[PDB]
Structures are given as structure tokens and as C-alpha cells.
Amino acid sequence: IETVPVKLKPGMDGPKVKQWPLTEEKIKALVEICTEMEKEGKISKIGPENPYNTPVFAIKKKDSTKWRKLVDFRELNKRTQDFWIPHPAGLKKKKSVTVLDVGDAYFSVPLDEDFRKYTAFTIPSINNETPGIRYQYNVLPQGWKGSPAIFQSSMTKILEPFKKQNPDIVIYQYMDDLYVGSDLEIGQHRTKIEELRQHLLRWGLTTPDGYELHPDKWTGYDPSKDLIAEIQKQGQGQWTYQIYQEPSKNLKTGKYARKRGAHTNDVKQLTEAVQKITTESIVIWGKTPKFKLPIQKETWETWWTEYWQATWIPEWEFV
């Protein structure tokens, strides 16, 4: 076949980020996953000769029993070159929008051999029987900024048939998810989703069941600048947030009520709020905000991975 040359931004080296400790449950799940990815060729074992590292952990999506590997490529993404498909203002106007995970599609495209070293990561060892189990990718990895950009031409022709027969439908890709929206009746909308998934399945693409959304009831953007989200605790499970680019010019405000449940706390509820706000920012503007979270760094960093349910990770800072 053939790959796409890729580069880090000028003057920048690959990531050297320590692996953080994990629960035995997550370690066991990463070992099962990575064992299989290795046999399939998607990743290769490596040793300490590779000086780069990126943290890994494991998560379960909302209403799902399947562990999913999540590599926190945020540092590699900052350092990866920019790549040179505008945002659909119509998406936020649709009666219904379904979110499909298509991250499995990347694993069919090889990664430039000279870039692979930068994607190394380390599964910690249970009971310290080894110093760790290390791998690097041979294919486009989920969560890397480069993967949807390189795959895009492939994605366009995967979707050309379906779009040709359904122009009343909007399909927007952000990172590793498709956003599929229509004003159709929900029954009509839900079966068009199946139709799309059948088609993607014919291409090998399997898709975890998607989250549904209805933005038409959600109630001066400069796309060259970052979005910022601030969150405040209100008490009794309630939260407020503002999204803005210049401090006094708010573009959106809202409030978030914590998920019902016997087990809850501020960290879990914050991860819920971040995920709901990020999802809305993507549908409205196509960008994930940088979050200002009302919580101590150490507390967040100790616990947030116990509650994360998304395949992406935003930037955040603390107080």
C-alpha cells in the first residue's frame, strides 16, 4: 500500500509523559485488548529503547459493558502538524441528531513508519511483575488529530452512496464520531440510522450504539479563536456554565442537573457536565472548549478517570 508522511510542528519533539497508575480492573482489560490488537498487527510490542510515552487508560461508554482503550493523545496532538469541510450551521437546527462512534475505521489505514514511535504507551504491570507492557501503533490510532484528517478521503467515499440517496440528512464528523441529523419523525430517523450502520458495516465499520440528541430545543463567534467554558457549582446536584471567547461576551449559558443515582460526588458530576457541554459545543461550533473547572488539580487528576465515558479528552485548567 502507501502511507501519508506526517511531521511534528517545527522545533517540537514527541511526547514523554509518565503513565499514571490504574486499577487492576483497567490493567486486566488493557492487556486483553492490546493482546488482540498485537495479533492483528494494529500495534507492536516495544521496549525502553523508545523514549516517548503517552498515558493510556480504559473506560466504558454510557450504558455499555465493553471496556474501550483510551490513549490521552492530547500532548501528541498539540505537537502534531496542522492539516490542510466547514461546519454545518444546519446541524443544531435538526429535530434529531445521532452520534456514532466510527473510530474502528482507522485501523485499516497504516501509519507513516517514521511517525509510529511517537504513539508509544505503557500498560502498567499488576503486582509489578514487569516494568510495564509497551506498544506503539502501526495504523491510524483513535484519538490522534491526524487520524480523521488522513482517513477523510476514505470516509467521504464510504459515505458517498448513502448521502446521494438522503440529501435531507446531515452527516458531520468530529474526531472519531459521526453526527447524523434529520428533521424526520423519530421512527423514520431511527431506521435511516440503521440503514447508515448497515452500509458502514458492509465496509467493515462496526458502530457502538449511538447517543441520540435533539438540538432544536436547546435554547459573535470567531472560529479562529478557542472556546472557553467556565463551570460553577450551585448545590443540590446543580451546576451552571458559560461558554465564551472574550470574557464579557458570553455566547451560551446553561445549567446542568446531575444524573440521578445513589453513587455521586462532585468529580463524577463535573465529568458529566464537561461531556454534555463539549457535546453541545461540537454540534453548535465544531470545536471543543477549554474548560475552567471549579476543583483542585490533584483531586481531579486522582479521580476523573473513574467516571470518564468519552473517547476524547478536552483541555482543562483548575483553581
Residue numbers in the entry: 5 to 88, 94 to 218, 231 to 240, 318 to 417
Paper excerpt:
Formation of active HIV-1 reverse transcriptase (RT) proceeds via a structural maturation process that involves subdomain rearrangements and formation of an asymmetric p66/p66′ homodimer. We utilized the isolated polymerase domain, p51, rather than p66, since the initial subdomain rearrangements are largely limited to this domain. Two different fingers/palm/connection (FPC) subdomain constructs containing the same interfaces that are present in the monomers and in the p51 subunit of the RT heterodimer were investigated using both NMR spectroscopy and X-ray crystallography.
In addition, we relied on our previous strategy of deleting a disordered palm subdomain C-terminal segment (Lys219—Met230, referred to as the palm loop or PL) in order to block the metamorphic transition to p51* and, consequently, dimer formation. The fingers/palm/connection FPC1 contains the same palm subdomain deletion used in our previous studies of the p51 monomer. The globular fingers, palm, and connection subdomains of FPC1 overlay well with those of both the p51 subunit of RT and the p51 monomer. Although crystal structures were obtained for both FPC1 and FPC2, the FPC constructs did not crystallize readily, perhaps due to the dynamic behavior of several loops.
